[PDB]
């Protein structure tokens, strides 16, 4: 029959571990490093582009930083195609909530729902898990600026500063070293770039290998603004922070 060829993706190891989850996490540990840092006046998302060429169009490119809501954005580490599947369902869930309650979806509710979908592929279906780790950057009028992270297991946690993908151990040590509770966005932007510049597997940290986004409540407005940095804007901030 068919049983012969069944990998059994949703079974426990003798130790009580989920094979496919563990192996999916191993897959992500090779993907470009993504960093999120939450400050008092906003949040910073930074991501290192894995594999680039001279002929790679960076202006029309987006592989790690995606807009879910007007208040919620994500940083991606792992399979881009798997991530886009989950991103689309998350974008729909946000709109379902807005249509139902006439209010924007609270960050955790959206995060939990995506994490629950990931958990599903972990317990039933016989399908492989999504080889994706998300860093959620979002704002709502309950908890303010929030930073979440989710992995193939379907587990999510909140952070002041976090990294996913490659060299997370080295990145987390550097973040835990220089992070302070009273930080400003501009300080966080710098911390994010410094941490990446030291964890990079490449020679130098150039603009063409980076994606940058900040979620700030521009004082001269009163509303939350999402800013996905353009190639030139990344090039500028890279010089100012003293990396050139």
């Amino acid at each position: 029959g068919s049983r012969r060829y069944d990998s059994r993706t949703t079974i426990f190891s003798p130790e009580g571990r989920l094979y496919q989850v563990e192996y999916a996490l191993e897959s992500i540990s090779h993907a470009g490093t993504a960093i999120g840092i939450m400050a008092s006046d906003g949040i910073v998302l930074a991501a290192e582009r894995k594999v680039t060429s001279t002929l790679l169009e960076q202006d029309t490119s987006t592989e790690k930083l995606y807009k879910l809501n007007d208040k919620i954005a994500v940083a991606v580490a792992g399979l881009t195609a798997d991530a886009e599947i989950l991103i689309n369902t998350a974008r729909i869930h946000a709109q379902n909530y807005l249509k139902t309650y006439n209010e924007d979806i609270p960050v955790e509710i959206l995060v939990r729902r995506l994490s629950d979908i990931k958990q599903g592929y972990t317990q039933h279906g016989g399908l492989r898990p999504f080889g994706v780790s998300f860093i959620y950057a979002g704002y709502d009028d309950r908890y303010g600026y929030q930073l979440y992270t989710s992995n193939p297991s379907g587990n999510y946690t909140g952070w002041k500063a976090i990294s996913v993908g490659a060299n997370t151990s080295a990145a987390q040590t550097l973040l835990q070293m220089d992070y302070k509770d009273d930080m400003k966005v501009d300080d966080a932007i710098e911390l994010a770039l410094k941490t990446l510049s030291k964890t990079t597997d490449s020679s130098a940290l150039t603009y063409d290998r980076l994606e940058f986004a900040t979620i700030r409540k521009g004082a001269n407005d009163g509303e939350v603004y999402q800013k996905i940095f353009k190639p030139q804007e990344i090039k500028d901030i890279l010089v100012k922070t003293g990396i050139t």
């Binding site: 249509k99 139902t100 006439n102 209010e103 509710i109």
Partner: protein, 198 residues
């Protein structure tokens, strides 16, 4: 139909609901509470089809209570009313629609302002300083168009409702056996046990 009245004052929303339940020839009950508490600061009154009326109310109540526990948070009166509207908007195009008209009176703790929502069985939601369902509105709206101010105190609002009930007791054909009056403010929902002769 049963009498369903609502009035938003300065710091509270007051709901007045008739106590009578009539089936055909007989008045079966004269102490019926035509309301449900969806959350500590949100109250919903209802009138309509015999079975649908309570069934819909308890169904909505269950969903808001489930949300409250899941999030450890109370939805704003606007968010609850938008949820109720969508439920009725689904219902109207189903096999057997809920024939229930509702008034949602809630105090928004975030805005620190009272709110009153009127939604009919079709899913027609509107926010009002004062609202009524059925034939009640035909006598009451002109009364309230005349005597209503937005700065009125809760006591002024109770005097204003008394004036509405008196008009409904004079000109209405049905004996609705008086009303149960409830106040929704910053401190939650309480029942005025003394409206039989206030």
């Amino acid at each position: 139909m049963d009498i369903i009245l609502g009035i938003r004052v300065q710091d509270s929303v007051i709901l007045a609901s008739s106590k009578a339940v009539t089936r055909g020839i007989s008045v079966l009950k004269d102490s019926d509470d035509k309301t449900r508490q969806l959350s500590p600061h949100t109250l919903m009154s209802f009138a309509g089809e015999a079975g649908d009326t309570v069934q819909f109310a308890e169904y909505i109540q269950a969903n808001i209570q489930l949300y409250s526990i899941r999030e450890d948070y109370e939805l704003s009166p606007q968010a609850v009313s938008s949820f109720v509207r969508q439920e009725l908007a689904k219902s109207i195009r189903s096999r057997r629609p809920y024939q229930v008209n509702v008034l949602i009176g809630g105090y928004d703790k975030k805005k620190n302002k009272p709110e009153l929502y009127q939604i009919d069985y079709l899913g027609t939601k509107v926010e009002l300083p004062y609202g009524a369902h059925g034939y009640s509105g035909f006598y009451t709206f002109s009364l309230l168009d005349h005597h209503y101010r937005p700065d009125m105190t809760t006591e002024e609002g109770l005097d204003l409702l008394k004036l509405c009930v008196q008009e409904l007791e004079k000109r209405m054909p049905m004996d609705f056996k008086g009303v149960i009056v409830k106040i929704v403010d910053k401190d939650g929902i309480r029942q005025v046990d003394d409206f039989q002769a206030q």
